[PDB]
Design a protein around this nucleic acid. Structure first.
Lengths: 125, 236, 128, 237
RNA sequence: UACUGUCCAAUGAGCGCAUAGUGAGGGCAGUA
RNA sequence: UACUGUCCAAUGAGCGCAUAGUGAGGGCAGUA
């Protein structure tokens, strides 16, 4: 089923998965901040790698600010079709409507991340 | 400039200043008037109702039974009480200087008071256009307060709930405008911290909803307050 | 043999019979939350001037680790007494280990007031 | 009472830290204004005094790194080979007499400060072991002179609860004070430090008190507590 | 949580960042 | 600690005072 128009950019059923096991991986690695609040904190502080949001979160607007902080420091962001999924992915019993992957010098995830960064760019204008 | 909010925030401030003044006047009029009718202080406990009365009965205590104006302000109970207790007054009359001053002070209270209301009517009538969903949860007042110190509904929407909760704290440690709001205040004091967190949290949501002028007729806001009200009724 | 020979610096040293009354009092004040257990913790109650008396154990090796206390109850004019066993004392404060210093904090409207009263007088008596 | 010896040592102790700072800074100045020729050497030997010492010799001519006598006695020979290979593969240019003159001059400075440093530590460690011998045995000459500096002398230092003593001269890291950054604590796995501090803190409070009254002058209690502590550190890994 | 065994413990167990901060499981009942 | 039942929980569980302060039990292993 089609998502709300504001959800953009929206990731292929492929990108979706690639993202969610990045997020899982970056979870057992200390480089994950989970929750729309904590998400914003890190955007503010300039230490976010990318943002993942959950286009099924109502009211949608409850996360739509994050996109506007990605403009201050240019930072990527994507919408996966479902938050229930993104919660399992972050290592939590409950839904998660956004998350943010910390910046940490010399992280073995360093490559697997930029891999995602550059993947989202290709989605945008 | 021309920041609409800044005015609202600014106006809402009078109302607390006027609120402070009214308080002083009351304490004053209660203080002076107790020379003519001491016991009244405690029959009418209500600041405003107490003034309206000393303005009404004044030096002649007898004019308070049968009184049309009074009857529209005080229950029959309280009226019939002040009436009997005022044939046993226990205090002398007032010299013109003492009366004109006190009467003049009353007139002030009321002019302030009723002007404070015309100010509130503005602050709500606006606060619900700049940030409707917010106002419904905390209070048009308290809303405009935090929005004032956040410096805009936009910068407000770019904040973590954790922070918002803290907006306006310097009493108690890390109590801010939300902790002192009406909603957070109207419950048993132990339940007030869990309650501040909650309300801060849910306002950070409404704030964000309204930074996009969605749900303008006010939807989100009511549902949100409901969820909050039940979470309370659950706690006891 | 008489173990009646303890370090002399441990002054004044409670009469056996007295020594009971303290441990007993200390045991109760532990239950009325008017008790602090510890070298360090007692020092605090002295400075904050909220200790009725100090009880120390002469067992305490090296003894100097608590001798700083008597010099402090001089300043704040607080009664202080030594009992013979750090071990006996620990057990009074209800602790499986030894306790070499404890203090009975001040607190208003407590039933042990007159008890403490007496104890205090009785200590005064030997400091004089 | 007038000029009390402790004060003189506290202030004396302080010049050492002043000089750590001064050297730390001279270090950075030389490795920097030298990383122009042999920029790599910096990364090769990471040790201040050694570095500074070497760069005074090496100097303007960098041929003959092998078989020099002080280059030898100042350096391990296993690490004197790894230079001549990156010495031939030189990465920088020769130096003006104005840029060298100020480098040599700032080395002599470095060393002469370093001398003065040690010979102050020698003084403090000595007199400290007469002033408060047991306290010293545990944490160390200097650190002991620090807790004393601020406590205002062994008497008060003594009347202090360990909790307070632990926090002496703290403001980097919250509620960590002289003893936390002491030697005997820092030499541990970082997870072990927040505990170790309170352990040391508390034993120091005992020594401190024992020294207050001038017992265990030979240093007995001190040595004992230092052992009871080291041993608990093993049981602890 | 109970019990058992061992170690450590008032001669101090455990705590200790950031408040425009923190950031995961938690409460109640019953059973073991 | 574990199990069950139920109520909450990233749309945020829990924290929020003292730091020249705090002040009691704790860790680990075996058993249920």
């Amino acid at each position: 089923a089609d998502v709300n128009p504001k959800a953009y950019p929206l990731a292929d059923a492929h990108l979706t998965k690639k993202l969610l096991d990045l997020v899982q991986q970056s979870c057992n690695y200390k480089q994950l901040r989970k929750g729309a609040n904590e998400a914003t904190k890190t955007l503010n502080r300039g230490i976010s790698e990318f943002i993942v949001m959950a286009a099924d979160a109502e009211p949608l607007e409850i996360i739509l600010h994050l996109p506007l902080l990605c403009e201050d420091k240019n930072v990527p962001y994507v919408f996966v079709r479902s938050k229930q999924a993104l919660g399992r992915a972050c290592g939590v019993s409950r839904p998660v409507i956004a998350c943010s992957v910390t910046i940490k010098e010399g992280s073995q995830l360093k490559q697997q991340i930029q891999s995602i960064q550059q993947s989202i760019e290709r989605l945008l204008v | 400039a021309a920041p609409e909010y800044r005015v609202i925030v600014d106006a809402n401030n009078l109302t607390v200043e006027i609120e402070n003044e009214l308080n002083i006047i009351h304490k004053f009029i209660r203080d002076k008037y107790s020379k003519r009718f001491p016991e009244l202080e405690s029959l009418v406990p209500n600041a405003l109702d107490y003034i309206r009365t000393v303005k009404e009965l004044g030096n002649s205590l007898d004019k308070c039974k049968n009184n049309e104006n009074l009857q529209q302000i005080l229950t029959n109970a309280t009226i019939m009480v002040v009436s009997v207790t005022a044939s046993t007054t226990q205090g002398q009359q007032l010299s013109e200087e003492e009366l004109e001053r006190l009467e003049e002070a009353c007139d002030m209270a009321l002019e302030l008071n009723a002007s404070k209301h015309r100010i509130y009517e503005y602050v709500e009538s606006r606060m619900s256009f700049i940030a409707p969903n917010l106002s419904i949860i905390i209070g048009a007042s308290t809303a405009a307060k935090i929005m004032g110190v956040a410096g805009g509904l936009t910068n407000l929407s770019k904040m973590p709930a954790c922070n918002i909760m803290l907006l306006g704290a310097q009493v108690l440690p890390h109590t801010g405008y939300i902790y002192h709001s009406d909603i957070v205040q109207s419950l048993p004091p132990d339940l007030r911290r869990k309650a501040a967190r909650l309300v801060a949290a849910k306002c950070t949501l409404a704030a964000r909803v309204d930074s996009f002028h969605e749900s303008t007729e006010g939807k989100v806001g009511y549902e949100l307050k409901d969820e909050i009200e039940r979470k309370f009724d659950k706690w006891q």
